[PDB]
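Standup notes
- HV: blocked on the assembly model, inputs below
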Amino acid sequence: FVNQHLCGSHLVEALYLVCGERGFFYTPK
Amino acid sequence: FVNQHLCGSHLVEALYLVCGERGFFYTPK
Amino acid sequence: FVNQHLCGSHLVEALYLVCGERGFFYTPK
Amino acid sequence: FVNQHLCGSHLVEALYLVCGERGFFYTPK
Amino acid sequence: FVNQHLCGSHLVEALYLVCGERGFFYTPK
Amino acid sequence: FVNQHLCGSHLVEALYLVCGERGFFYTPK
Amino acid sequence: GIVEQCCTSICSLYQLENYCN
Amino acid sequence: GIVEQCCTSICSLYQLENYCN
Amino acid sequence: GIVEQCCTSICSLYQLENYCN
Amino acid sequence: GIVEQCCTSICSLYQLENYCN
Amino acid sequence: GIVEQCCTSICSLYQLENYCN
Amino acid sequence: GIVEQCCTSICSLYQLENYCN
Ligand SMILES: *C(=O)CCCCCCCCCCCCC
Ligand SMILES: *C(=O)CCCCCCCCCCCCC
Ligand SMILES: *C(=O)CCCCCCCCCCCCC
Ligand SMILES: *C(=O)CCCCCCCCCCC[C@H](*)C
Ligand SMILES: *C(=O)CCCCCCCCCCC[C@H](*)C
Ligand SMILES: *C(=O)CCCCCCCCCCC[C@H](*)C
Ligand SMILES: [Cl-]
Ligand SMILES: [Cl-]
Ligand SMILES: [Zn+2]
Ligand SMILES: [Zn+2]
């Protein structure tokens, strides 16, 4: 599905800004 | 370094497309 | 229409990464 | 050069908005 | 609501390109 | 300076997420 | 405003320029 | 998870911080 | 075309590569 | 300005808040 | 090319139009 | 790390796969 993929693209960008030096793991559904 | 921060934002968006359903980990430090 | 325009924005970014040095032509509907 | 690659990602997104329904071509080489 | 937030993300990027040196004020609903 | 222009595009997207419903102002000059 | 107009229809560069300072 | 929560409602910075390492 | 195929289903890297020059 | 302060050095999330409305 | 002209100096919105179809 | 390997030189699509889960 496309719109969930689009939301995920902005999601990882938000996580990159918020997490910073700590980093993050991104796991989709 | 701001240039390092800008590069990381493109790395996470590249990982999101490349990995797909697998997901990815971003760990600078 | 807006949501198709939004999907196209992420589409050309994906094409830029995948195509690389070959380049691409983007033509909307 | 990574800085060249980062710049190209902003060029394609700029072309997508500027050209609109016309579309665009991205040819670095 | 999510999809309006997603459209706003591409909206401010478009405003940054179009406005240039003049700048802009972004105020959501 | 192109590098300044590229940095500003990441500044506006950072402000959009950070400020939220408050909104933001981008004024380089 | 800008969300109402440009998130329901595709705004051209001239329409986007209206919200500039 | 993160898609279920933050793609149905707007997640604030604190909510996004929950998924950090 | 590319909008019809890849904005209704998630296109993989190989599918996206089809539209390259 | 935001360019002279956040593009020469990395601005934290709190520093970016100084340019919110 | 667009890289040699728009990545070494800032290209205006009109200059980017030269690479539209 | 990914920063020391992909921000100093361009990482191909296959090299980015090394950091997938
Ligand atoms: C308007 O032009 C803003 C005035 C201050 C601009 C400072 C830009 C400094 C040049 C960039 C240095 C870093 C390049 C990687
Ligand atoms: C294909 O490789 C394009 C040929 C011209 C490339 C010019 C790149 C110049 C190097 C970047 C200089 C600016 C770095 C901040
Ligand atoms: C955490 O700080 C990562 C450790 C390695 C960082 C390397 C950054 C090198 C400086 C940037 C050089 C290129 C600038 C255009
Ligand atoms: C992946 O298979 C997605 C799994 C979660 C289901 C998402 C869709 C749920 C119903 C949404 C309907 C709205 C779009 C027609
Ligand atoms: C440009 O005119 C778009 C042409 C393709 C039609 C897109 C819409 C098809 C029906 C989708 C309905 C879902 C949104 C209400
Ligand atoms: C913030 O509260 C949004 C206020 C504007 C209302 C947006 C939704 C209007 C109806 C859209 C329905 C389509 C999605 C189910
Ligand atoms: Cl950049
Ligand atoms: Cl979107
Ligand atoms: Zn960038
Ligand atoms: Zn989007």
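- HV (later): unblocked. The pocket of chloride ion (ligand 7) is lined by residues B 6; D 6; F 6 (CB under 6 Å). The two ends of chain G are 15 Å apart (CA to CA).
- Next: hand off to the docking folks.
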